[PDB]
Design a protein around this nucleic acid. Sequence first.
RNA 1: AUGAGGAUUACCCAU
RNA 2: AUGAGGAUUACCCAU
RNA 3: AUGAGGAUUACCCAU
RNA 4: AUGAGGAUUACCCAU
Lengths: 129, 129, 129, 129, 129, 129
Amino acid sequence: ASNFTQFVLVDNGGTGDVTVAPSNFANGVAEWISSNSRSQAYKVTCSVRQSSAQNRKYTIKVEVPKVATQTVGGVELPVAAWRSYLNMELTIPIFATNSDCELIVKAMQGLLKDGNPIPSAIAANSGIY
Amino acid sequence: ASNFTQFVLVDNGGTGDVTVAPSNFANGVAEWISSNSRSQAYKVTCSVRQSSAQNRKYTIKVEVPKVATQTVGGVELPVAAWRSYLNMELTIPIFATNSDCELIVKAMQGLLKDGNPIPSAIAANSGIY
Amino acid sequence: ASNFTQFVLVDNGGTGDVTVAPSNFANGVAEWISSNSRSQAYKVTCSVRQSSAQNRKYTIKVEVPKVATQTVGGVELPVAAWRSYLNMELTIPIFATNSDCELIVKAMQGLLKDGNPIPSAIAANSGIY
Amino acid sequence: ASNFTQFVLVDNGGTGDVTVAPSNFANGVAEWISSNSRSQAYKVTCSVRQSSAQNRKYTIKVEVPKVATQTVGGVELPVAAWRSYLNMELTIPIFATNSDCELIVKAMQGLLKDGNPIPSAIAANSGIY
Amino acid sequence: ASNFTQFVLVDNGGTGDVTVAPSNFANGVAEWISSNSRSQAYKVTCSVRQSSAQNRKYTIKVEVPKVATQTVGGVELPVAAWRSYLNMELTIPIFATNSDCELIVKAMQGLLKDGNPIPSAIAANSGIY
Amino acid sequence: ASNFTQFVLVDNGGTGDVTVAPSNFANGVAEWISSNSRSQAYKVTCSVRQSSAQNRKYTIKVEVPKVATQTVGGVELPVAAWRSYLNMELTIPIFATNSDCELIVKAMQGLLKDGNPIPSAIAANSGIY
RNA sequence: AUGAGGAUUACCCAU
RNA sequence: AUGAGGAUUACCCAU
RNA sequence: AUGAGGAUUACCCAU
RNA sequence: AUGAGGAUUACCCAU
């Protein structure tokens, strides 16, 4: 066992899938990056700290790039037109059992399931109404 | 007893379970992540330290993704809308024996057991009433 | 009722029990140690005193060795990695009768009884949840 | 009963065993030393105090010497090339029953058992990985 | 998945091989050390970091000891008569793809291959001629 | 007899192999450069010198270019989009015999062997984890 | 009271 | 440039 | 002489 | 510690 393994970030049904792999663990921050130049890579980081005497806090971040080729000084460089950033913070009391935590995971999964309000809004450049 | 191993975080009874596996150990801070992009993964980190002369403190952090209307592998912004954060901090006096600690763990499991108030509130998007 | 005597600290049901026996009485501070080097022994000390005009206070300290991967009689450094420390301080008002005190002892036994939260937490390297 | 008795600190299977014996109890500090010149002896000390109103703290220390013969001013003296020090502090709430304490002892014993992670690392001049 | 593992630093067939094992990863600096006396051990450290806006930089260090015994006052200690210090810094622009990096590694391996100028000059206390 | 000769820096089988050839040896600094445009060439320099009374020190440098064509005003020139810079210093006491040096070289070759931590971390835009 | 602070005449140190 | 000048990280020194 | 200091006409910087 | 605060070298900002 070791949960620090590679995984499929973007699932495009076996073709053009974006898989992310472990790349660094310096300073207690777990990092995963897609197989690209550091300038065009997808990035995922995770860290856990004992925020309070009775809380533990997970800090998760994802970076989705819009890859492009830019000409600088007459030369072509692999670059990122822009990046989308996801920053999530999860605070869990120390009294939460494993089953209480499994509940939290399922909630986050249900939150983003296809067809549900939120992902439907995001995917359509809309708000909730 | 090497305890840094893979384990079931969200138990949906064999089918659709969420397994979290070791992914980083930088700075004695153990990390576990699910097989997802880091922006949509379930993340768990844990570390222990002597907070003061009389106490030891465990800091546990968990991150859970919102799943409803989630687009697997997609770029979902703002991050704060798609993630839940749990920060647990457990303070244990240096006088606590293994038995004392086992009792402390039971208190945590009981706090989160199915049907008890706290988890029933969280799950129903409610408070106490 | 001379109570300074040998007694079973860790009960593993007759076989593999850890007995602790009187080893020092300097300064009215009773001490008990297991039959080990002092760096790997189970140690227990107890003393009572009038903390203030209205209270009496018992100070109980226990030391427990980390046993997993322990080398009997070997030199294990750093000390702080191989030992657990328990500091108990019990304050009892001078008005407490023997009955009141018996009740206080039951509260302590109940707090640590098998299956209750606190010991269940400690034993599972967890907090409350 | 009196737990202040001699015991085998280093077990080398009946031959070359390092047994330690009671040597002092001044100032509430129980001391044991191996049968050597005070300059080359193994030393073990234990003391218990009521650290807080509700905690008891055991302070245990072991000293493992590397014996050598040094020539000073043209004369040979029994000496110690260097010493390894183990300092452990154990804090136990006053609410811990005897069985809760037996749990603590077993934990420390399991922690150092041959073959387990920690003693395996120490014995090999390595870290955990 | 982890690359912070044990590995062979010096390959002498399969007998006399020098192996370094992880020992510590504090402050983003990974450290490996060979077994036995830390005083006579081989050391290797590695760290990575964003030096500037477009460059990541690796700092790798190796220490080769000259194993010897020091005798002073008739007291002998295992020591290193002296040490050889290899210190290298590698800068890589964030535009480097994995292919580009693989090339950079082959350049380093080729630079030190048996028979080539640099490695054979060093192996003979010589310079270029 | 001479070691200031041509050699293979990058080994790609036998086709696409990068070869550097001597170019200049002024001021005790030996320099090798690959053929074609100096602008897109691989560079290697090496020098040795008595740093202190007991230490000799080698300073080796390698430059890996990213071959590209720059177009400005419709005028294209062969250039390097950027360069990777390897800079290493090796210190060796004057007490090192040829055997000691050979060991130091094997340590360097082992440090970069395929499959080992450092070389595989670099080859993947990653760090240690 | 806390330190994955240092040492070794049950001792210094920081907060 | 010279020294039957001195030393030893291809270096000081006198004229 | 040291830097997990920065770069890239064997070069700058801090101590 | 809190922000339906801002960004993107695990970083600034207000309270």
